[PDB]
Design a protein around this nucleic acid. Structure first.
Ligand SMILES: Nc1ccn([C@H]2C[C@H](O)[C@@H](COP(=O)(O)OP(=O)(O)C(F)(F)P(=O)(O)O)O2)c(=O)n1
Ligand SMILES: Nc1ccn([C@H]2C[C@H](O)[C@@H](COP(=O)(O)O)O2)c(=O)n1
Ligand SMILES: [Cl-]
Ligand SMILES: [Mg+2]
Ligand SMILES: [Mg+2]
Ligand code: NA
Ligand code: NA
Ligand code: NA
Length: 326
DNA sequence: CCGACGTCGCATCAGC
DNA sequence: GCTGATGCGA
DNA sequence: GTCGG
């Protein structure tokens, strides 16, 4: 990409602030700056040019000038050399180990993959499965494999109840040629914002996907959100496919458009869009868009009959999913 | 200057 | 057990 | 770290 050096640098800084500094707003600020620079259609020649972009301020402008002149960032070099930052940044790559747990592990001398494997009993269940599949979860999924995973999920869901509709969102819905994982939005007419007239609606689907050995592990599971692991079947004598992260979100059927807007993302696009809603006097979650009174308190949900209706309320032109990869 | 920064599900824990 | 952080994840 | 009142 045109400015990959800069955006990689800002991403590394974002990860440092989140994992080591535990500064969530600095993390979001760095990621916002990297996103807006990543879609900028010119090769950036100076910090001043970058600072014209929203989300890029004086401090990042200076870092961009350092990076353009030398090819590196001293602040990052020194972070790379720091053993505590390095260990913390590694441990947070395990699903379920966040900033707090990583600093606690390092305090107890648990700082390497070998250390984690030695101390499996010091891990909660999520962390245990994240360590089990640590290698696999850093692999990406070719769209071709996403299409085979789609086929299984949709056909197994149809076998449980033909009135389910499963929609693959995430980067897949944005048309990406590869995805980090699989995101499945699920609806059923028995579950609306007005009533839940059938229990176990998410459970039954998970059960069936476990039955056919597609779902292999569970990280967390409640009435509307499953977070787990899945794997495509491989042919005779073939090496197995990597295990993959899968997230399933059951959304009230009448709130599908807010739900599919949310689960299609990207995460940065969602933040930017919801922040624009707030400036426009609305609040958007995965269920509703609601107005804000002078109070500052959310009012009643507005009528939504398409993704575009949500864009219309906040005075944004519609953006197809493929144009939301911020 | 400085308050706001997206929103929420599930797991875990502390306090009652 | 419940309720309200807090952690970690989407 | 950046932005907007
Ligand atoms: N902090 C977040 C994370 C995710 N999300 C939403 C948007 C996002 O697209 C959806 C799925 O989360 P993923 O982490 O799987 O992101 P993704 O868009 O599918 C992706 F591109 F990162 P992936 O292909 O690597 O999974 O959940 C969000 O709103 N806020
Ligand atoms: N998972 C899904 C996907 C679509 N739908 C419904 C919402 C709309 O009535 C209709 C839109 O179809 P589509 O947007 O996929 O062309 O399907 C649903 O209820 N659950
Ligand atoms: Cl709501
Ligand atoms: Mg995804
Ligand atoms: Mg603001
Ligand atoms: Na700027
Ligand atoms: Na992690
Ligand atoms: Na996901």
């Amino acid at each position: 990409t045109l400015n990959g050096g800069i955006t990689d640098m800002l991403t590394e800084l974002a990860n440092f602030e989140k994992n080591v500094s535990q500064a969530i707003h600095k993390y979001n600020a760095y990621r916002k700056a990297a996103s807006v620079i990543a879609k900028y259609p010119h090769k950036i020649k100076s910090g001043a040019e970058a600072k014209k972009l929203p989300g890029v301020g004086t401090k990042i402008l200076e870092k961009i000038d350092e990076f353009l002149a030398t090819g590196k960032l001293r602040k990052l070099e020194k972070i790379r050399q720091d053993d505590t930052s390095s260990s913390i940044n590694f441990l947070t790559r395990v699903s379920g180990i966040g900033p707090s747990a990583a600093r606690k592990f390092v305090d107890e001398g648990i700082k390497t993959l070998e250390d984690l494997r030695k101390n499996e009993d010091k891990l909660n269940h999520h962390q245990r499965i994240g360590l089990k599949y640590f290698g696999d979860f850093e692999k990406r999924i070719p769209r071709e494999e996403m299409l085979q995973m789609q086929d299984i999920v949709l056909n197994e869901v149809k076998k449980v109840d033909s009135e389910y509709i499963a929609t693959v969102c995430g980067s897949f819905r944005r048309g990406a040629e590869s995805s980090g994982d699989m995101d499945v939005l699920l609806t059923h007419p028995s579950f609306t914002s007005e009533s839940t007239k059938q229990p176990k609606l998410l459970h039954q689907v998970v059960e069936q996907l476990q039955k056919v050995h597609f779902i292999t592990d569970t990280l967390s599971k409640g009435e509307t959100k499953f977070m787990g692991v899945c794997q495509l079947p491989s042919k005779n004598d073939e090496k197995e496919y990597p295990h993959r992260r899968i997230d399933i979100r059951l959304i009230p059927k009448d709130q599908y458009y807010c739900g599919v807007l949310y689960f299609t993302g990207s995460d940065i696009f969602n933040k930017n869009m919801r922040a624009h809603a707030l400036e426009k006097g609305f609040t958007i979650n995965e269920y509703t868009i609601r107005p804000l009174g002078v109070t500052g308190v959310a009012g009643e949900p507005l009528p939504v009959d398409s993704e575009k209706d949500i864009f219309d309320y906040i005075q944004w032109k519609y953006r197809e999913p493929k144009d939301r990869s911020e």
